[PDB]
Amino acid sequence: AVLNQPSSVSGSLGQRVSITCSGSSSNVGNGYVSWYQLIPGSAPRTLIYGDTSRASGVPDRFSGSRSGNTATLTISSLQAEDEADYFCASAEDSSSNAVFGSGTTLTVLGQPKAAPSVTLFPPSSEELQANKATLVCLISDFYPGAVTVAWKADSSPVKAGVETTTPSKQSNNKYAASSYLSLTPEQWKSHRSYSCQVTHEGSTVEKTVAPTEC
Amino acid sequence: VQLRESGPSLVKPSQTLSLTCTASGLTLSDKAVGWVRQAPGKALEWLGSIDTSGNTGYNPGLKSRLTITKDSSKSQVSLSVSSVTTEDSATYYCTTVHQQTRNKVYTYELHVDTWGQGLLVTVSSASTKGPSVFPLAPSSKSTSGGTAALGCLVKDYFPEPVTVSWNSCALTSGVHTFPAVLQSSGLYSLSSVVTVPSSSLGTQTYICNVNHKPSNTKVDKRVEPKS
């Protein structure tokens, strides 16, 4: 089976949010639910066990509670570090077949807005001497994480050969994204300039690189 | 308590995935070792566990393809997944589970205590390919009047993952490593960037260390500024 969890919940910095963990009378009914935190790029971290007990190192702002066939994980005084995926888990009676929840992505709102800074790297000497050419557009230090990226060649739109990652959190809890434009050295040498156009909250930052001189 | 997963990161479809887990610093509460995996975009999935007495419990939806044995002498646990499909590509975790008695009747309570680092496994017929590493050199464009951005480009590798550090991990402040893009050719690429003070560009050498375990490849690319 799978325990029912809300797909995603949101809370403001310094507030409290609760994540519900619904189940049947066999898994959560017996009632010893556990809670785990998955930060991308890190091993899962046990938060709560035995419904209420906090695991080793878990601050007191993480609490647990159960009511019949529904357990609840409450996080008070939300910090930006609390943005992660949360899963509940319970033993299905026989204590040999664990069941995890569908998962809940917690996003922390109320962070200061930040405009993106964009760096556009031309292909290097090494890559150009390998019959390859890739333009790398790195976007960092922006919030919220909703941007669009567009490439130009001599102010004419380019749609082919573009690969872009989804925004991801960085060290200072701001977002960063990357986009790439794969070319042949002939194409790179052909045009007079190339541009990476990043749009964030109605405004647009554009970086231009040229093959002529760097 | 330390748990280390070992095994292949690439397996061909229809083959058998074999994973080992070596534990160090076992305590008295570590009474069973279990296996959990997480496919991309899906929730955590329990696989099975085995206790000190040798009893094995399996996920009933997968027991026809799972086997879990242990070697307490070497302090190891092994997981085998037979006839793998692309639905079996996931990060496989080794775990120590605890069992504390609430007794008051025998009401028990189980939870995962320590999680392993996780081993990323990809099911595919494509061949392993080590990465080409090129430098993203800082120029008079990539400077921000005091800070300058530099990085390295890890191009065309398979399969995931690729880890990148800077100066053999001596440089961590201001580093960001982006997730990978899956090109049309079926190869992965990512970038690692770090912002440094502009003054140090002529006094501090910056070397990006790319590591690609799936092909046992390690690259140390030096990133020199553009003249």
Side-chain half-sphere exposure of B28, counting CA atoms within 13 A: 1
* Spans of all domains in chain A: 8-109, 117-209
Contact B191 A136 (CB under 8 A): yes
Same domain, B23 and B100: yes
What tokens were used for A132? Answer: 């390859």
Same domain, B96 and B68: yes
Is B224 within 8 Å of chain A by CB? no
Residue B227 lies in a domain: no
Question: Following DSSP, what letter does each residue of A3-43 receive, concatenated?
Answer: BB--SEEEEETT-EEEEEEE--TTTTTT---EEEEE-TTS-
Domain end (from B123, B145, B172): B123
Instruction: Give the residues across from A34 on adjacent strands.
Output: A89
Report whether B13 contacts B84 (CB < 8 A): yes
Query: Hey, is the C-beta of A99 within 8 angstroms of any chain B C-beta?
Result: yes
In a domain, B67, yes or no: yes
| Residue in the structure block whose two tokens are 């496989």 | B92
Interface contact B226, partner A, CB < 8 A: yes
- How was this structure obtained? X-ray
Distance from CA of B96 to the nearest CA of A (A): 11
**Residues in chain A closer than 8 A to B55 (CB atoms):** 96
> B215 and B141 in one domain?
yes
Contact A43/B117, CB-based, under 8 Å?
yes
Record the resolution, in angstroms.
2.8
B168: Cβ contacts below 8 Å, ≥ 6 apart:
B207, B209
Measured distance CA(B60)–CA(B74) in Å, rounded? 28
A contacts of B183 (beta carbons < 8 Å):
163, 182
Specify burial of residue A181 (Cβ count, 10 A radius: 0-12, 13-18, 19+): buried
CA angle (A154 as vertex; A151, A160 as ends), nearest 5: 40
CA pseudo-torsion sign B13, B189, A124, B204: negative
CATH 3.40.630.30 fits A8-109, yes or no: no
CB–CB of B44 and A130 under 8 A? Answer: no
Query: How far apart are the CA of A95 and the nearest CA of chain B, in angstroms?
Result: 7
Tokens encoding B204:
């501090």
3-state secondary structure A111-137: CCCECCEEEEECCCHHHHCCCCEEEEE
Residues B113 and B20 occupy one common structural domain: yes
Pick from A2, A30, A50: CB nearest B43: A2
Number of domains into which chain B is organized: 2
Domain A117-209 belongs to what architecture? Answer: Sandwich (2.60)
Domain extent, residue B144, equals 132-222
Give me the residue label for tokens 């799978």. Answer: A2
Phi, psi of B213 (to 5 degrees): -55, -40
* Inter-CA distances, B98 with A84, A101, A120, B2, B164, Å: 24, 19, 50, 15, 34
In the listed set B78, B101, B123, which residue is the last one of a domain according to the structure?
B123
Strands (E), A50-167: 53-54, 62-67, 70-76, 84-91, 98-100, 104-109, 117-121, 133-142, 148-153, 156-158, 162-164
Cβ-nearest to A170 among B176, B181, B226: B176
Burial class (CB in 10 A: 0-12, 13-18, 19+), B170: exposed
**CA closest to B92 among chain A residues:** A43
Tokens 């930040």: give the residue: A114
Contact predicate B219/B209, CB 8 Å: yes
Verify whether the Cβ–Cβ distance A50 to B117 is below 8 Å.
no
What phi and psi, each to the nearest 5 degrees, are found at residue A43?
A: -70, 145
Q: What CATH number is attached to the domain comprising B202?
A: 2.60.40.10
